[PDB]
Ligand binder design. Structure first.
Ligand SMILES: CCOc1cc(/C=C2\SC(=S)NC2=O)ccc1O
Length: 343
């Protein structure tokens, strides 16, 4: 059997051969990314004389359609003249090659999960976390612009990449799961660890879900471990409740999936259903962050910029990003005005 004249495998992924040249321009070096959508490869562009990442979409209608949306959003974002756009990954060009849609991006360095792995999952400093935090809030502010109103929908450490390995500048990648503000066609969205409560509760969602994700990411970056690492959605919600308490009554009353995690008593109050968890709100972020005990695990004790005063600024901001209510949850503009960022 042969697929796409022998260019494709059984999955209709392009069979990548190191050293291959495409259209007398791009020289394929190696495969750098693998996904349901297709593959990502590192290539040299002879014309621009630079390294580029090429996202090779699978040769199937479904995956092509998904990527077409990705392209519109990427091109829409690149359209704006604002300087905030530079925190978003830049799509240089797109083309059809051997029945595969290919997105050409600027080559980027290690993702934030790689950084975590490199620390043996013990996290990076508050100073570097602040730098990452400021850039991400700026990125979300840009996404929040009315013309765009883009929800990334899959924010996580892996999806945040450094421009250069020796600088701290970051760019958000993978808009393949992104959508614009509108009707909640998709209920099951976001990576589980970074999934907002509104999504878990099957309620309407806005751009605030990304902000929730950011809060989880920022805590994760400093500690090295996901704030909430549920094995399932129920476990996810229970892990959120451990830190933040039972969600407010006004939310759960409106929540279609409230009874998946909670039960409503005769008095009309909400409790966790029975089916190993600390009581609601007793896994304090104050202690997770090690505000008063020299940071997480005491590894930051004696380090500049790791004072109680510093940690309290970080904690307050995080707690504003992890507001249960998406209408009151801090917005990118206000987050950038937080005392955590002041000099
Ligand atoms: C290992 C992936 O490395 C890169 C990845 C991207 C962008 C991607 S990957 C994906 S999946 N969707 C994107 O937009 C850009 C530059 C890179 O160096």
């Amino acid at each position: 059997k042969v697929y796409n004249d022998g260019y494709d495998d059984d999955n209709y992924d392009y069979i990548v051969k190191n050293g291959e040249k495409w259209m007398d321009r791009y020289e394929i070096d190696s495969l750098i990314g693998k996904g349901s959508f297709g593959q990502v490869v590192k290539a040299y562009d002879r014309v621009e004389q630079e390294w580029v990442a090429i996202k090779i979409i699978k040769n199937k209608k479904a995956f092509l359609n998904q990527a077409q949306i990705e392209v519109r959003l990427l091109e829409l974002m690149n359209k704006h003249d604002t300087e905030m756009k530079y925190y978003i990954v830049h799509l240089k060009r797109h083309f059809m090659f051997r029945n595969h849609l290919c997105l050409v991006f600027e080559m980027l360095s290690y993702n934030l999960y790689d950084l975590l792995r490199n620390t043996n999952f013990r996290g990076v400093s508050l100073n570097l976390t602040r730098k990452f935090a400021q850039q991400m809030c700026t990125a979300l502010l840009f996404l929040a612009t009315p013309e765009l109103s883009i929800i990334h929908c899959d924010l996580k450490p892996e999806n945040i990449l450094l421009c250069n390995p020796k600088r701290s500048a970051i760019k958000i990648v993978d808009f393949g799961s992104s959508c614009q503000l509108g009707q909640r066609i998709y209920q099951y969205i976001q990576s589980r660890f970074y999934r907002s409560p509104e999504v878990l509760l099957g309620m309407p969602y806005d751009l605030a879900i990304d902000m929730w994700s950011l809060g989880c990411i920022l805590v994760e970056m400093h500690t090295g471990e996901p704030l909430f690492s549920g094995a399932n959605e129920v476990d996810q919600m229970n892990k959120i409740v451990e830190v933040l308490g039972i969600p407010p009554a006004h939310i759960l009353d409106q929540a279609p999936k409230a009874r998946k995690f909670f039960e409503k008593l005769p008095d009309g109050t909400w409790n966790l259903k029975k089916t190993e968890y600390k009581p609601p709100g007793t896994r304090k972020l104050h202690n997770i962050l090690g505000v008063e005990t020299g940071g997480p695990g005491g590894r930051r004790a004696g380090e500049s910029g790791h004072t109680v005063a510093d940690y309290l600024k970080f904690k307050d901001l995080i707690l504003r990003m992890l507001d249960y209510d998406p209408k009151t949850r801090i917005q990118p503009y206000y987050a950038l005005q937080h005392s955590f960022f002041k000099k």
